[model samples]
Target chain A: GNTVTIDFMSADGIVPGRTPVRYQGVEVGTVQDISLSDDLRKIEVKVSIKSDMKDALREETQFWLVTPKASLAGVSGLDALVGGNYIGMMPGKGKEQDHFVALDTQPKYRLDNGDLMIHLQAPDLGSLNSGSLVYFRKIPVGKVYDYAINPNKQGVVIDVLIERRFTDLVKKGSRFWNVSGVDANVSISGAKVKLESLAALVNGAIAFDSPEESKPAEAEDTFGLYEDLAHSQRGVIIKLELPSGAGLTADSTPLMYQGLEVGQLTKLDLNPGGKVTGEMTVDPSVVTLLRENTRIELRNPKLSLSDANLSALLTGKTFELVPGDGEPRKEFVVV
Target chain B: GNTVTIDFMSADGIVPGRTPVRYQGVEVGTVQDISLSDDLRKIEVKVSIKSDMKDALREETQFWLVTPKASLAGVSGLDALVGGNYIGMMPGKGKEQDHFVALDTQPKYRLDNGDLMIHLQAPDLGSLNSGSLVYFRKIPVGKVYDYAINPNKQGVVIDVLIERRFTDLVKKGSRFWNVSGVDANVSISGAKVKLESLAALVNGAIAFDSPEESKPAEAEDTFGLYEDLAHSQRGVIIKLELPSGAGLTADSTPLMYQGLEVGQLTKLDLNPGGKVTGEMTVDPSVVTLLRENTRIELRNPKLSLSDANLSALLTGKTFELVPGDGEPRKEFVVV
Candidate 1:
């Protein structure tokens, strides 16, 4: 008579008693009750799984209500179309548990044996969700299986699992980013087109890469999930000692050159001396442009017809680099 | 069977065979026929008067279709209310005439012996009609006997009759103006109250006055009907050599001093020298103020509070004067 209860916050469409529970594709339990939270902010779902499968009812076990979904990429839970809704589960690895609070969204990484689970934090979750493919050089090598809002509620903590064969590609300096669809931008120059992956065009996707001198990645390693390829391509981080009142923040502020976004301010803080210092990530592609004589200046964008070619002027203020002849350097201070 | 044919412009209410003619409130004739003009502009009426009175008909005779009128001033042709409509007449002094164009309104003055008739003209007729009273120092001295559009139709030509006793008051330098009702003006000085006449409030009226040194007015003399006392109060005309670019025209512009309107531009034309010379009539009260050093300037009214005390701005462009201490002069150029 052993049973387990789990609650889920949802965007609706979950039915009590009618929706069943499943392990992989086989029915393992049934939803017992449904009610609203005291503040009506979430749906409190009480789920009862079979006593015989108590071995899979451990502390780490996860459940997500799944519906039959068919998109341009592929199909999942097609049987749910005829058999009705059910809870899709991954057996827990810890001691058996009888009650649990459910995740707001399905985990983004698959929970299978040999899957290298990695934790990542992102300022926002664009479209990454369970079943979103992870790509290494356009090949599907991992996926987003689970995600949760961080305890402090500042951002999202994503769970990604990489296939055993491609696990070696992730290193200490690896950068992860969303690669969900075609990145198309139009400006005075022309249209630039970038296709992340065929599967990514239908479902969301993630991509990552390491710098040339990085060491191998380890299990349980924590990494930052960047916004996009433009941000993830940074191979070097430069520390900038800027004058106070520069108005720069740790949020996204692209470093621009010749109308192209070449880098971004990743972290900014006011030092004890009342001056501001910040870390900026620059793409290796622009490594040759960073010379000893280069000057970094904060320039406010001017809204004018003649400055239309400068895309940064349209988006907002940008950190500009005035390149000069010399060997490549990575540190600078505003004069 | 003396018959007279008269043409009248009207919208209706005239009945042939049933309508009568009256002289001194006695039935003297009857309307015989009513017919439409070929242009549909007037009703051609044939009326028959007693044969004995036919000798009174002359070329200058006048007629008006009468109705019973009761207004705030008093009643007129009250018998018409019980006896129905009638034709009112004024015998002329010229040779006999059997055909005439009737006045559109009732004659305000009876054309009996001792009634003095004079002609006047105005740019616009506000509420004045034939029955409108004529005031001499607030006393009802006469009324508009008849009115007609001028030969050229540029203005209204009013045939005003004055009582024989008041006729002596009008002289060669007489000034005539409309005294329609209460004239109220709000300015920096405060609200000004000038009541032309209590009867003028019920029906429109006109007032006239002669200068102290003027000779007797001739019967053949004609006069310009002023809009109000401000314009009629002018006794002397001053010539101004204005700059060619000045936007003033002869149509109607006030000449002002301080905040009081004392005169107006009476005539304007471009002289052969290409300089604009305009004639302005000034009040005798301000004549001494026009000295050799007097400055005449074109001041356009400003639409702001800082210039609120300058009444010209609230009215319109005004010819302003700055008095001087030198010998009095009647002519000058704009400074």
Candidate 2:
């Protein structure tokens, strides 16, 4: 019949003649040959498909290798242990394509899976990836389905799903935050630790919460993915302009008002004409707290045994949010 | 007026309204706006060209920013010191096109430069770049004019030019070698150094010599670029398969026969069914030295205070090219 090429990341344990393709319950193709790709980064699998299965070759068609995959959900491709690994296909309605890039892994969920899907945009992909978990109050509710890069390449739009029972929890004004790592605190009171979950820590995860349990979130409404729980709990992402070299790093330095931590910087970028600025996520209480002429200072506070808080020893720097003597205002500049 | 896009790697010192385009000494276009491209790595330069110059826009057309360049040869775009940076165009005769990806920098030489151009294929670009000098007996004869990647992505075909006067030196068996670095020898006879030249050491250079001084090489004939002068002086690229992990590295680890250095490994790749093989370029003098069953051994020699050949102290391991008492043979394997 006709042949098509699928570029796969690995050719381990794959036999050219023994490997066969299965599409929508039909054995459509057999692996004819395997060779290194032009770029040498991947292996090109030339598969000969049955003449009648020509409709399976499309521009949007997906192909993957089926090996043993074990999860708490269930183990798949276990029969491959005896029969050998086979090629898997997911058909798409698009133009005919002779060459295709195989997916990194078999997608856990699909578009029409009848799950509650939501789109969240973030400044960067970070460690978050597809198959990562979605948690509501620390419970595994769903998972990250897919992510598309911003058209202008500014950020990424990650599509995540919510379980049917947990759909009601994501409402209007709901905030989502990344829980890829633990936030350990060394405060004056003592040491406090909050590890999201074992799976969330290793695989990355997104957690959501409703500040004011209002109307249910619409599928069309796009949300912003906060850097972490501390940022999302604040409910406000503000901007601050500074001269340069404050040694301020996003997602590390804490914004402290008196003895309490209120916010942290999420992103920092050098602006045109040689000025530096950082986008900070702050607490809702900071809305009424920031006033006109308020001077936020870059602090290199004490980190000694006699100090009131040893948090300074842990996080190298801190943003001291000073109280203002003037009327309520929004603009901020790190002094 | 027709507007087209030129995606540039950078927008430094480039003003939208002030930056104009020139083609064949004619100011045919004006820069309209500059913005980030879809991928964000490059800046999109929106240019408005004269409708009459539409023929200049083609699939093969090349565009690049012309800034003041100062070199020992001469300075170019010096007029831009006052007029500011402008877009430069190289017209092509291919299919009509609107969008173009600008070159990283201006090309030093063109196809019809009346120089003796020769094609040399190297396994990699390494530090070799355009404008890098070509040497004949350590004197600058020409330069690296251009290079194209292999269709199979195996290596790069570098187009180098030899001055018309020195064209006689290139023959059918003319050997070309890369002189990108100085080989500092810490031999038993004190430390001897041979630095090719200032430009050759840093920017990279290619030197050629006719082995047998046969008929002059044709422009259509292509030759291989040796790893270094050591490999070219020998003129033989042979392969040897080994088990695994002999601490062998490509471009290093010299092969020694008795007390002399004869060859070095150029490339290494693992084969199917778990076997590693490396390509070694040897000297022409080793042709009659091999025997059918000669067992070459991998030697982890001494790096001692009283060692005879301290070359072992520097180069980690060496290939012991054992002598075979039988017939002269070619194929080899490290035991």
Candidate 3:
């Protein structure tokens, strides 16, 4: 309940500092005070917090560290034009929070054992290139942690820090790809594959063991790069010709019985013969059930299937009973 | 488009006059004139709409012959009240230009032959009470037009109208139930299988025809009678236990695997030891799939399967996930 004050070391000697510095997004505690340790060689800062919320703050909380105005992903891109100092903090859970007597420990980049380091050929500034995104399932996960040029300076070198929880999944067989905005490259055991422009949109592909594919109860740290991407396949395509005036459009949802949407009409394009064909892709799960006898119907916004007719009457709306494509032999559902 | 005035019907009407008229929800047109028809018989009203949007109006547009509201599930309930005597302009292929036509039809007493009817006897009454709603599947498909007591004034006869399209479905075996407030009797094949009390609330019952014993479909109205109520040679039944705080509460909504709502919980009670038990009967269609491990997770306020991580990462607070029994089984999703 009591607030604390503290002083911090400055170029011009001790300066008055306030209580309560934020660490790792939580207001851990208040700074009691700041002073020079007897040995003038070090500075002492005191902090405190409520007893209940203070338990986890002791060791894991990393003190604020001052650095240039740059981030791992953003700073490298602006290093040439922007130059300013920035301050930052990160939670150092295990060892960093080990000693928390009275003085706040200075933030440091501590590496733990089993921590994986991914090194790669870096970006070439002369080529007007910025860094690339480290993506997982098309979403940016991490970034190029740091990079350096090879001694030869002909090709660049890069050091990337993938997160801790995900590190174990990136084992020896896991491949890496450089998703340069203009071009993309995939490497699996040095079997390199280059993809251009638009293809790069689906970049930085990395696969691993699927939860279902793995034998239940059999656990492994690092996963292979095949199963994850292999089972993530999409669907089967089909085409149907709906009547012209039925208001059928390319974006219409293809339904199974009773508004159960099974697929979508991806395109309503006229063939060279001037016929409107609704092209679509159906989910494989229902592929087998959509048989030769299956008929497809477009649901009209006007017609309503109420509980009365639904319970007793069969007011069959002719356009509402289209069947599906012929059945397939096997199928797996999408997650 | 030039300014062209066309007749319109609004969703809501006001007390005496000057209430804003709406079409398809947008304020279009206005009530140009309102009066009673020639014989002071029916309500006659007129409206106007902009020419550009006039293409949406039509001839086959069956004005309610009374004001009524349009609905996603056609018109019924409060919508019937809003759309009571209003003009409902349903556009057709034939009517293209901007124009208007007067609707001349009386709210009826008879429907397309063979749809639905009831034999009611209110002894000692000259006529059945007015404001009686003839419901079909919980919807007011039509209302009781009028009634006439027997010659001795010992009993009354009610006339009901049903939509034409529902004709074939309502066979000779269907049953009819009175939905006027509380205090009504439900008779299906002369069997009073149901007892209702309007004391506190009201609930609608169903009636339909039982297929002829010798034929696959021929049968009379059998509404309000559970399908199994009829004498049958072959059938299937399933029983599943309901979890705690579960069973068919008023809103159970019945979870359907593939839109086929398999079962409904009929009763809920605690075993002698206080464990919750639900008695449920499965529909004949999906009854077979009820096996031991066919587990059912009572989708309560805690299940976070859909986009769970995304939500957890975004807001520190967890958002509620609503369970829709109508949704297809997530486990069986098509890949």
Candidate 4:
């Protein structure tokens, strides 16, 4: 009996170059050649196996290979990407040899990185990377690694990957968002800007690390993206009634430590004669260190030129305080 | 007419000294006293009005005051405590002018202090005062005001406040954590902890003036309980991974502010690999002035340290990196 000719298919619908060949699911050889058959639909694959397996060949053997269908493949890479491709000898059920069956569906393959993929909207689909995966708990459970300009929608050919372990967790309620860079948004709730160097912080792919549950997801997120915010309850707010005096205005700066700002001059209104009513949001943790003698200094960025100048140089810095003797956390903001 | 005894009641059922009583819905009086009626179920209230409002009084007038109840109340001293009270008025629209119906049901009202109240959780709490309001946007939307041990939970109740506008935004999704002092849970996100002077920045309250939402609202706020420990997030935490070479530890000490911290070595951890990741959350607004090349150095807390000591002191107290050379902000703690 002569050795069988096993025609192989492309891993990611890509061409035959750099694609390795495998034996019994391990890289025991390489795909010597890849070319289109006369019918065009069949991509001819020639695989060379180890010399030891040559004697076990027979006439009735069937070869297993993949077609380079860019639309259906999940990942494609050089030979080092998983010991190349392997060979499966569909030995007849009663055959004496230890060779296995050529299971057409179960490719006996899995990527260590789970399936790398990325999902992009119509505008971003073109710029998407081939192996972008929707990570669930830092593991690549699914991917959008391959795409083509969709013909009917004229957008993109969407390809997806689902890891065996996480297939059940993907449900109708799940959502995705841009996981890189700081995001900023302004809404009725006021302006909110959030950023992260996590991607740049660790130089890794975006991941959705959370527990899975069977609950219906929300219609939208607070930041317009699909994500979660806080997971605990120790939230507190500290408010203060600003000193009622003739000088109270909207521009007063609320001081905390060494003049550090724990809050700000939110509202300034009048009460009886010249009494002022101002509001501020204080950091909950610092609220207790306030003393009975705390004084609220009404400072105008315009009039407090020196402080402003010093502050400008210290922008994006920690709260600083002005040291004073017997100066306790005061309740007044403009006194 | 002789001064009429204008009796009233608090919304949550009792009258606290400062409960403002209103006439025609405008604040014209306050709850002066509370007594019992024949049935005991009816609590009699003594209301006082501004001297000028006497002209608008009549025998048939009605009086009611607004206050808070347990179900809806939050941080105490900001508004009313667990058993605190308030007063509201409902003048007899038709004819009653002097006599009015009192409300036994709790009513919500804003703190005279700009709706915000703040509190600070400190082990050495005696070192500070009470009635501190947390300010943000220059408004005293919350306060500290006082402290008490919650009999039910056995935890210290750091009084807090929040303006009506920000109330909904301050619950569950947020946290109140310590900044400058010592404790567990090193500050990872410097944007939250507000540090300042005991005299000037006194342990008041800190708050996010306006932060842009980076993760979706679903992102968990896992670290909101740092306040309970009365500790500062500064020290080292070791993160261990398999394979000795892959194990990496991060030291939060020498907390970065402009890449700096102010004072104290409050925490340290050896993780499984003896690797440490310390926390030192600095005020970004204050630390952003550091130049790019200024390297952060970590050193043991020392008594003979100099400028190098200043560098380590900057951690936890400061949390930013300046782009280039810039002026330094005022110093608060001795490094």
Q: What is the lDDT of residue A299 in candidate 1?
A: 79
Model 2 regions lying over 4 Å from their true place: A1-65, A68-77, A94-111, A151-154, A182-194, A213-215, A219-221, A235-282, A286-327, A332-335, B1-335
- Candidate 1 lDDT over B1-335, as tens digits, reads 67788877552345565777887678888888865443233456789888767866678878887755542123764676677667878776878676788886765555457767788877656457567788777777888877765544246677888888877887887889877644344334464545555666655788887678978775757889988776665578888887743335464567767867777787776443235577888788888888888888877654444644543433445678778988988888875
lDDT of 4 by residue, A1-335 (tens): 12223333433333345443333222334555655567643555555555544444444455454432234443222222222343334322243332322335333232333332333234234223544434443333455445556456644444445554454444443444434434454322123343432221222233343324544222212111222222111223334555443433353444444333345444556677765565554555555554565444543434232221222222222222222335445444433
Using TM-score as the measure, what is the rank order of every candidate, best first? 2, 1, 4, 3
Query: Across residues A113-155, which tens digit of lDDT does each residue of candidate 1 receive?
Result: 4657889988888877666777654445677767889888788
lDDT of 3 by residue, B8-123 (tens): 22222322244334444455555555433221122334455567556565544433323332311123435435432233344455554434443333333333365545434332
Candidate 1 ranges beyond 4 A from true positions: A1-335, B1-23, B27-77, B83-110, B181-183, B189-198, B239-329
lDDT of each: 0.68, 0.69, 0.38, 0.38
Go through the candidates in order and give each one's DockQ.
0.00, 0.01, 0.01, 0.01
**lDDT of the structure predicted as candidate 2:** 0.69
By the lDDT metric, which is better: model 1 or model 2? 2
Positional deviation of A160 in candidate 3, in angstroms? 9.9
Per-residue lDDT tens digits of candidate 3, residues A1-335? 43332333441222234333333212335555555667663445555555544443334444442333246423221211221222223433454243333223333343432344566543342221222344443323344444466689676665555654455334443444443333323321112232322222322322122132223221222221112221233466665665552455444344433333346556666667765565566666656555565566554433233211221112122233233455542222111
Model 3 has a DockQ score of 0.01
Model 2 lDDT tens row, A1-335: 77798877654446666778877545788989876533233466789988776864678788887765432123565665556668778877888889898885675536565567888888766557567888877778888887765554345788888877777778878888887754444444454555567776555788888666589885757999887665665556677876554345556667888778888778776443335677787778777777787888876644344655643444545688877767876668776
**Residue B130 in model 2: shift from native, Å?**
30
Where is the poorest 10-residue window by lDDT in model 2 chain B? B186-195
